[PDB]
Amino acid sequence: VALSLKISIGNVVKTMQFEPSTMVYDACRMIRERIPEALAGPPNDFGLFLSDDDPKKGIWLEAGKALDYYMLRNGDTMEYRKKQRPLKIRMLDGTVKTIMVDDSKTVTDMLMTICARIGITNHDEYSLVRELWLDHGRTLREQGVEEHETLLLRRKFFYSDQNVDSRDPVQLNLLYVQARDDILNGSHPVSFDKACEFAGFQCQIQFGPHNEQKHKAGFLDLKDFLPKEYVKQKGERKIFQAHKNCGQMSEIEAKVRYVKLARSLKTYGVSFFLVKEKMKGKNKLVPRLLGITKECVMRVDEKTKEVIQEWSLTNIKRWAASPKSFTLDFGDYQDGYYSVQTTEGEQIAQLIAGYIDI
């Protein structure tokens, strides 16, 4: 009724007899009394390990369990193996530190050990991330992480303001979809540079961190990532440099950065109309974007989205629509009406009237 188990240590294999109820912690002691190789380091740096052809499936025995918890049988082998191994962690400043960690611990337990060595007490404001997602309640080993891999130390993201809250993913996703769709469909006009910035975050959100082997030329369908007017361009390299610049940023940080970026623009929350300006004495017309808000009218370059002129709504003296044009009269504020060619004049006139009313 004794269990006869082969103990492997280095190149030694010695069969020892154990009662099936022997606690692992006592079994380790027993081994340390009999094989000098077992004394290579302190007891807490070693344990018993059952290997598997799949390295992911080898398991460390728990000190406080009995051997028979593990269903051990006569002729099985247990390895008395060092738990401590060196793990490369990327710090926040980009440098890489090599820290001794216990292979039998969960990611969470290691992270606590890691933080304490570098002087961080709030270990739960951090997570570890892999270099090509880790459950922090499982071990690195069982998740297929190989010992030569570097992990990154990443601070959990928190941001909130009057507009967005990183703690409420549902609401955040509503605001992100709205801002993104308005940008993709041209409702919110943006420069090419800003479109490509937005699309970098979009890539981060849809694909995760940039992967140079997979996220290569011709990977994106640019019609899904840029306003139409920018598809006829070399946008992909610009988008991927923005994507890359996101590093290991979480999906929620990326959404928050997208929404804040959209709200920072002069053009955000403005109702836009695509109109044309007549050029005196010439046939050409010049496209322009005309924007209206509760506080102002803006004249915006159709290409660059620069605001080239702006007026307060309180400066309008009168305004007039016809079936082909729309005209603003600013009276003594400036010399000359602003008139534009458009078939949407009634609708512009109506938006203005509504704002002036209040």
Where in the chain are the domains?
1-83, 84-129+138-157, 158-267, 268-358
Question: What CATH fold (topology level) applies to the domain 84-129+138-157?
Answer: Ubiquitin-like (UB roll) (3.10.20)
Q: Note the CATH architecture for domain 268-358.
A: Roll (2.30)
Retrieve residue 263's tokens. Answer: 């709200």
* Closest by Cα among 10, 53, 15 to 34: 15
* Closest by Cα among 325, 294, 300 to 312: 294
Residue 239, CB-side half-sphere exposure with 13 Å CA sphere: 30
What is residue 331's three-state secondary structure? helix
Q: Rounded to whole angstroms, how far apart are CA atoms 69 and 74? A: 14
CATH class of the structural domain 1-83: alpha beta
Tell me the pairing of strands 77-82 and 3-9: parallel
- Determine the distance from the C-alpha atom of residue 339 to the mean position of all C-alpha atoms in its chain, rounded to a whole number: 46
Q: Do domains 1-83 and 158-267 have the same CATH topology?
A: no
Largest distance between two CA atoms of the chain? 109
251 class by beta-carbon count within 10 Å (0-12 exposed, 13-18 middle, 19+ buried): middle
Contacts of 91 (CB under 8 A, 6+ apart): 97, 118, 153
Question: What CATH fold (topology level) applies to the domain 158-267?
Answer: Acyl-CoA Binding Protein (1.20.80)
Q: Residue 40: how many CB atoms within 10 A of its CB? A: 12
Experimental resolution (Å) = 1.9
| Helix residue spans in 101-214 (DSSP H) | 107-117, 169-184, 192-207
Residue indicated by tokens 């109820």: 21
Q: Rounded to whole angstroms, how far apart are CA atoms 136 and 350? A: 57
